[PDB]
């Protein structure tokens, strides 16, 4: 794989450091990445860092002989959490196209949340196109790990549903949905659906009926 | 002050050429080294090469082959193309200004040095997905509010976006008037192989007879825009 793993507790000092050192004198560059979003340039230089990036991320300068590369966060926090990517240029290896590999920052120890959960009936314009689906979503819950099953009345479904992976939000909570499809002649034939969503070991249960 | 802002097809069919451009605004093409970077599920950053300022190119010898990097001066914007694209080729595109180093561990005279190259400053980037199958517009269905009463003032109201192939979707709310209470979910990716999403909202109770609620949907790719009302 290209990722390498690495968990840290909350409050605490992230120690990071590039795959390879180098031979001779060197000119490393940092960068974060959260999937989905632009990289951002942490460090550049060694030790050189860009405005508007915070005081907390710091990099090994080489003075003297050598230093080995490191990257250091002070107090890190859930909004670090991100893939870390060590630029490393040095004076015996040439130009270094490949970005190497990258340290998934896990930050641990956040706070339990209960999930927030919204379910929403099959609307009239979908039901008027014979089709119809249930909406639930999930939010700001954490830890990402989430158990979601629909009822029919009583009684278990498992047809036609279709859910996300949860996945870290703005505010640094998970957030996951899922999808029921129905022919509307089966979303009448029940007197209600039910969203019934686990998390760590509570459960936040919903329900809609035909109107 | 450069603003990078990137623009694709979104789909690409396999064996045809991908096409990306980076529109620049309020900086100078020709002042700046140029780059572009891609990312893929399953891998890592990927460095496709760089353009500089006097329009010299150097090629990822990986990609190299495959890939032109070009320069527009007069629409200030520049070009990344690859030619015969496959499945490996789906990735986020990400365009950005390049700026160059140079350490000397020794005298300059003699060549001892060499020069290395970072990146500043980074567009969001473009969704580009190739495939055999073509692209699927989504259709918006508004998702009703409760009405009365929750004994807060706030029910919860949203549209839903369904069956788009590929992604991604951008969602606004009363032409971008309404950012507050939105929440825009991650798509899920179907057995059909289609995407949906639902974007959500909190407002409050009272407001709700009377209030505008109009939910945009953005499919660049399909390329459908529809604007959706929600009524309790």
């Known amino acids: 794989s290209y990722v390498r793993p690495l968990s840290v507790a909350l409050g605490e000092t992230a120690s990071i450091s590039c795959g390879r050192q180098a031979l001779g004198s060197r000119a490393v560059q940092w960068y974060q990445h959260r999937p989905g979003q632009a990289p951002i340039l942490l460090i550049y230089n060694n030790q050189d860092r860009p405005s508007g990036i915070p005081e907390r991320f710091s990099g090994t300068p080489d003075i003297n002989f050598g230093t080995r590369a490191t990257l250091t966060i002070s107090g890190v926090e859930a909004g670090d959490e991100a893939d870390y990517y060590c630029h490393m240029w040095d004076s015996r290896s040439g130009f270094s196209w490949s970005f190497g590999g990258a340290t998934r920052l896990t930050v641990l120890g956040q706070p339990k949340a209960a999930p927030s959960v919204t379910l929403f009936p099959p609307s009239s314009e979908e039901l008027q196109a014979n089709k119809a689906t249930l909406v639930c979503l999930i939010s700001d819950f954490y830890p990402g790990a989430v158990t979601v099953a629909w009822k029919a009345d009583s009684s278990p479904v498992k047809a036609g549903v279709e859910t996300t992976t949860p996945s870290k939000q703005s505010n640094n909570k998970y957030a996951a949905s899922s999808y029921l499809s129905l022919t509307p002649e089966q979303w009448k034939s029940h007197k209600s659906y039910s969203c019934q969503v686990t998390h760590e070991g509570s459960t936040v249960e919903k329900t809609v009926a035909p109107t | 002050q450069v603003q990078l802002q990137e623009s694709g097809p979104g789909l690409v069919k396999p064996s045809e050429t991908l096409s990306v451009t980076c529109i620049v605004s309020?900086?100078?093409?020709?002042?700046?080294?140029w780059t572009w970077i891609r990312q893929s599920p399953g891998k890592g950053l990927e460095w496709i090469g760089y353009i500089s300022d006097r329009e010299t190119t150097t090629y990822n010898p990986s990609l190299k082959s495959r890939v032109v990097i070009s320069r527009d001066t007069s629409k200030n914007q520049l070009s990344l193309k690859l030619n015969s694209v496959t499945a490996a080729d789906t990735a986020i595109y990400y365009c950005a200004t390049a700026r160059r180093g140079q350490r000397i561990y020794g005298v300059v005279s003699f060549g001892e040095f060499f020069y290395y190259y970072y990146m500043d400053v980074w567009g969001k980037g473009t969704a580009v997905t190739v495939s055999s199958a073509s692209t699927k517009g989504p259709s918006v269905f508004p998702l009703a509010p409760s009405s009365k009463s929750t004994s807060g003032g706030t029910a919860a109201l949203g549209c839903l976006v369904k069956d788009y192939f590929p992604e991604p979707v951008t969602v606004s709310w009363n032409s971008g008037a309404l950012t507050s209470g939105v929440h825009t979910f991650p798509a899920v990716l179907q057995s059909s192989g289609l995407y949906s999403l639902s974007s959500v909202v909190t407002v409050p109770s009272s407001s709700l007879g009377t209030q505008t609620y109009i939910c945009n949907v953005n499919h660049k790719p399909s390329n459908t825009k529809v604007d959706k009302k929600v009524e309790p």
């Open positions: 309020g900086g100078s093409i020709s002042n700046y080294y």
